Enzyme design. Structure first.
Site, PDB file in Angstrom:
ATOM      1  N   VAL A  57       0.791  -1.159   0.000  1.00 48.10           N
ATOM      2  CA  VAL A  57       0.000   0.000   0.000  1.00 48.10           C
ATOM      3  C   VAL A  57       0.815   1.193   0.000  1.00 48.10           C
ATOM      4  CG1 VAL A  57      -1.345  -1.464   1.358  1.00 48.10           C
ATOM      5  CG2 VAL A  57      -0.609   0.735   2.238  1.00 48.10           C
ATOM      6  N   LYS A  64      -7.276   6.523  -0.892  1.00 42.82           N
ATOM      7  CA  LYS A  64      -8.602   6.023  -1.113  1.00 42.82           C
ATOM      8  C   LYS A  64      -9.088   5.502   0.204  1.00 42.82           C
ATOM      9  CE  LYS A  64      -6.872   5.802  -5.338  1.00 42.82           C
ATOM     10  NZ  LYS A  64      -6.672   5.911  -6.802  1.00 42.82           N
ATOM     11  N   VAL A  95     -22.458 -13.028 -20.675  1.00 44.58           N
ATOM     12  CA  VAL A  95     -22.781 -13.945 -21.731  1.00 44.58           C
ATOM     13  C   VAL A  95     -21.682 -14.980 -21.778  1.00 44.58           C
ATOM     14  CG1 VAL A  95     -23.275 -14.200 -24.075  1.00 44.58           C
ATOM     15  CG2 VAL A  95     -24.303 -12.340 -22.804  1.00 44.58           C
ATOM     16  N   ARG A 141     -29.549 -21.700 -11.206  1.00 41.10           N
ATOM     17  CA  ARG A 141     -28.871 -22.738 -10.476  1.00 41.10           C
ATOM     18  C   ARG A 141     -29.497 -24.082 -10.776  1.00 41.10           C
ATOM     19  NH1 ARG A 141     -24.082 -21.899  -8.074  1.00 41.10           N
ATOM     20  NH2 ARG A 141     -24.804 -23.849  -7.033  1.00 41.10           N
TER      21      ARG A 141
HETATM   22 NA    NA Z   1     -19.068 -14.115 -20.173  1.00 38.57          NA
HETATM   23 NA    NA Z   2       4.362   0.312   2.364  1.00 40.52          NA
END
Ligand code: NA
Ligand code: NA
Ligand SMILES: Cc1cn([C@H]2C[C@H](N=[N+]=[N-])[C@@H](COP(=O)(O)OP(=O)(O)OP(=O)(O)O)O2)c(=O)[nH]c1=O
Ligand SMILES: [Mn+2]
Ligand SMILES: [Mn+2]
EC number: 2.7.7.7
Length: 327
Positions: A57, A64, A95, A141
């Site tokens: 980080v 953020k 899709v 499902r």
């Molecule tokens: Na897809």
């Molecule tokens: Na760091």
DNA sequence: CATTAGA
DNA sequence: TCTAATG
């Protein structure tokens, strides 16, 4: 696990966005490790700087982290979510057969809706067409109750074809699961193993049988070892036809069946955990074998596995029914 | 992380 | 051949 919940979630929201909408593997990769790290951290991140100390980080992300800690939201995250262009992609991508790349391209040409896709079926390859066709059914499902009837069928033909075949529906279904997403059938045969240079028909004959009786209704992809298609339970005596289901069948050199079976039975956790244990217990496990470990650092030599058991015994564990291989 | 389509 | 998409 909840202590850093939003942080990791916002982070992944962010990652995923870089990769799909943008094609920034890097940042995309960035968000990911950070998300990975903060996830581990044992305490409640209270500010960016604290976070900042973490490996992965930096300044960008720390910033953020703040805005999110202060206002329970984030600009860019509000911006993105709104963005139609990016929503479009996140959608087309649903899709089967459409991935980010094609989602971007389509979008550019202005195909954003399912409908656009219909009016333009021409620009779509086979997979995606079939994907388009059953978009609805693919998202549903699989009630186990159906899974059982399906399994029930496949087994019979497989057998009717050659009594020699061995088939095991793997997956969550295997692990008890009330419903599953798609059916994975692992198949092998005695006359097919590590050496014995294939027998493509092996895979082919079953497919053909399955198709013969109308269980397979479409082919997404058929190769010499892995067939990927669509199936359907005979819509009884009408009023109720069954939704189109995704099915995958793969030929396995009989010498590595159980390893595979072990593997595709998951779960992801049972897997790793099984995997880590075999390590102490002087071995190694993978999609196809289990090799004793030698002290020089590493070592090979594929132990002889005759059932899921042997694997167990090897690492000297308790045979765990598929039902409990949940972690 | 490997197998297939496609161009 | 590479490059996408599934799992
Ligand atoms: Na897809
Ligand atoms: Na760091
Ligand atoms: C996603 C993924 C799955 N496979 C394995 C992981 C799984 N197994 N054990 C199988 C299929 O996983 P999958 O079909 O995605 O999920 P499953 O656990 O069967 O649950 P379902 O949602 O009810 O279908 O393939 C793989 O080899 N590489 C991958 O990246
Ligand atoms: Mn599955
Ligand atoms: Mn599957």
């Amino acid at each position: 696990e909840t202590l850093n919940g939003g942080i990791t979630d916002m982070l992944t929201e962010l990652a995923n966005f870089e990769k799909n909408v943008s094609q920034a593997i890097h940042k995309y990769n960035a968000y990911r490790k950070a998300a990975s790290v903060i996830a581990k951290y044992p305490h409640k991140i209270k500010s960016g700087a604290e976070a900042k100390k973490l490996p992965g980080v930096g300044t960008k992300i720390a910033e953020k982290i703040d805005e999110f800690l202060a206002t329970g939201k984030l600009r860019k995250l509000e911006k993105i979510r709104q963005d139609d262009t990016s929503s479009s992609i996140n959608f087309l991508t649903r899709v089967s057969g459409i991935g980010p790349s094609a989602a971007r391209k389509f979008v550019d040409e202005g195909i954003k809706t399912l409908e656009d896709l219909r009016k333009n079926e021409d620009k779509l390859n086979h997979h995606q067409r079939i994907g388009l066709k059953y978009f609805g059914d693919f998202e549903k499902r699989i009630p186990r109750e159906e899974m059982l009837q399906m399994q029930d069928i496949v087994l019979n033909e497989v057998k009717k074809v050659d009594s020699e075949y061995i088939a095991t529906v793997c997956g969550s279904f295997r692990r008890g699961a009330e419903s599953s997403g798609d059916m994975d059938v692992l198949l092998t045969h005695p006359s097919f193993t590590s050496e014995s240079t294939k027998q493509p028909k092996l895979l082919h004959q079953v497919v053909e049988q399955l198709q013969k009786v109308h269980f397979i209704t479409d082919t997404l992809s058929k190769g010499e070892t892995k067939f990927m298609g669509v199936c359907q339970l005979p819509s009884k005596n009408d009023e109720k036809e069954y939704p189109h289901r995704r099915i995958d069948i793969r030929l396995i050199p009989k010498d590595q069946y159980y390893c595979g079976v072990l593997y595709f039975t998951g779960s992801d956790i049972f897997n790793k955990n099984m995997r880590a244990h075999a390590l102490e217990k002087g071995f190694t496990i993978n999609e196809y074998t289990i090799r004793p470990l030698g002290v020089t650092g590493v070592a090979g030599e594929p132990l002889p596995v005759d059932s899921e058991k042997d694997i167990f015994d090897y690492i000297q564990w308790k045979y765990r029914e598929p039902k409990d291989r949940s972690e």
